[PDB]
């Protein structure tokens, strides 16, 4: 399971690429979604490769972001352990995070918005003109690499 | 091209194949009593006569076949689509 | 054979056994084919249908298995051909086959030939097959009369082994009569 974050805007981006991001529930910059590692989903992220940051996050990181940015299908309600417990098939955020990572469920199945609306990266990111191997922030990331970004966009 | 004066083919009247004779359609003479003839006289006056002041068009490089197919037994003719032919000569 | 661009005919075309242009026209009828084939000593008749992996023979008869019913004469003649067609046709009727089109392969459509004799046989067995009566040999020749009259110019027996001296088109009748009979073990 990988974490997808849009880092590049819609202006001038191919329509078929933009539509791919929308099918992945991301409609704004800094919006994140969790995607299972299947052949079908793999093709989608590869197509979006140049306007996104992705990679498998750690259990902890996912829990921090879920706690801080997860939302119900509708409404303001904070998604904390109690919320997770009173609305989901799990006992707390950790159980949900683990399930998401092991691809046993999805945010929607548990009554949560498929989108984690992140905050801009504190301290700024590495740039949207180059991929990770060139010092940029685009493309596939290391688990440590994704965590750094996700935590900075806490 | 060449073409047989007589040959077996379908007669739409007899409703069966029979020997037909092929002849080129000879132009029938005009009577000068058709409506268009009366309109020409009626409408022609002082100055330009509209459509009646026009003169005969030109010629296509080759004309289509204009034939009559006569049934050799019932004596009734029928017409067919023509085809472009520079010349058409009958064999016999 | 000569290079990458070289065109090798279909196998049955190389072997000179199948006329593919004729085959297509034959298959257009949608009906089963009455495959009439000859050999120097025998005559074969098969009712073949089209199949996913190749032709299907639903019924057949060989001039050799003619003896099984009481045939003591040679097997590469007119009477032999007719009877083999009738036998195949009868077996065809038993298999649920009602109609067929005559396939003569690479043989010639010669009037009074053995393939038409095979055809007449199958038709008499009950099979509806597109045909033309004046292309079939007259009854007597099918019986084998042409051979008896040939032996009439004796001096030396036509047949080497002893089936008979003057030959018997009557034997043909006996066999046909045996086949047209309802009982018969097909």
């Amino acid at each position: 399971m990988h974490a997808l974050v849009q880092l590049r805007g819609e202006v001038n981006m191919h329509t078929d690429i933009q539509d791919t991001l929308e099918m992945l529930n991301i409609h704004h910059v800094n919006h994140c979604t969790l995607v299972p590692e299947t052949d079908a989903y793999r093709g989608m992220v590869a197509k979006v490769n140049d306007f996104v940051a992705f990679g498998e996050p750690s259990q902890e990181t996912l829990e921090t972001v879920l706690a801080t940015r997860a939302e119900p299908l509708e409404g303001d309600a904070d998604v904390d352990d109690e919320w997770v417990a009173e609305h989901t098939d799990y006992d707390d955020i950790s159980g949900l995070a683990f399930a998401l990572l092991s691809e046993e469920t999805t945010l929607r199945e548990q009554g949560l918005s498929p989108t984690l609306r992140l905050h801009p990266p504190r301290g700024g990111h590495d740039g949207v003109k180059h991929p990770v191997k060139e010092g940029g922030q685009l493309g596939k990331h290391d688990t440590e690499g994704i965590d750094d970004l996700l935590e900075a966009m806490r | 091209m060449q073409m047989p004066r007589r040959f077996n083919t379908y007669c739409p009247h007899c409703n069966e194949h029979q020997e037909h004779e092929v002849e080129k359609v000879r132009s029938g003479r005009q009577t000068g009593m058709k409506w268009i003839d009366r309109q020409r006289e009626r409408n022609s006056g002082i100055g330009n006569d509209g459509k009646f002041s026009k003169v005969p068009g030109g010629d296509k490089p080759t004309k289509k076949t204009d034939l009559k197919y006569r049934c050799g037994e019932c004596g009734k003719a029928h017409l067919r689509e023509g085809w472009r032919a520079g010349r058409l000569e009958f064999q016999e | 054979a000569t290079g990458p661009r070289y065109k090798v005919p279909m196998r049955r075309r190389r072997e000179a056994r199948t006329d593919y242009h004729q085959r297509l026209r034959l298959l257009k009828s949608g009906k089963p084919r009455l495959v009439a084939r000859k050999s120097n000593k025998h005559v074969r008749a098969q009712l073949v249908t089209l199949g996913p992996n190749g032709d299907d023979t639903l019924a057949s008869a060989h001039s050799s298995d003619l003896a099984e019913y009481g045939w003591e004469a040679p097997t590469g003649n007119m009477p032999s051909a007719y009877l083999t067609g009738l036998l195949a046709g009868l077996r065809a009727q038993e298999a649920g086959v009602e109609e067929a089109v005559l396939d003569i392969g690479l043989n010639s459509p010669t009037p009074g030939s053995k393939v038409f004799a095979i055809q007449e046989g199958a038709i008499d067995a009950g099979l509806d097959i597109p045909h033309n009566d004046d292309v079939l040999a007259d009854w007597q020749r099918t019986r084998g009369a042409h051979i008896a009259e040939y032996d009439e110019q004796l001096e030396e027996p036509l047949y080497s082994g002893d089936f008979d001296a003057a030959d018997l088109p009557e034997h043909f009748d006996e066999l046909r009569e045996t086949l047209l009979d309802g009982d018969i073990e097909l």
Binding site: - | - | Y6, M10, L24
Partner: protein, 95 residues
């Protein structure tokens, strides 16, 4: 295009690879299809008759009856529904 006939720009699609040259096997020309069956359209260069407009090569339509020995296949050209008259010789079963 310099001309607008049916065979314009069909040099490739209507030509056989040298080895597939010559009269095609009869088996596929006599194949039978049922209404509802999905069929791929592809002209066989060696078979003159029973063809369709070359523009439709590669289409995958639905057999919806027949006219004589030829089949009536339904396709969608862009957004428009069309009916194509074509023989088995230029058709193949999908899957």
């Amino acid at each position: 295009p310099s001309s607008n006939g049916p065979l314009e720009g069909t040099r490739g699609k209507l030509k056989n690879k040298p080895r597939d040259r010559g009269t095609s096997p009869p088996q596929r020309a006599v194949e039978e299809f049922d209404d509802g069956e999905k069929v791929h359209l592809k002209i066989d260069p060696s078979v003159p008759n029973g063809r369709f407009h070359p523009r439709f090569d590669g289409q995958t339509g639905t057999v919806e009856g027949k006219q004589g020995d030829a089949y009536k296949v339904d396709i969608v050209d862009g957004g428009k529904e069309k009916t194509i008259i074509v023989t088995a010789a230029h058709l193949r079963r999908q899957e």
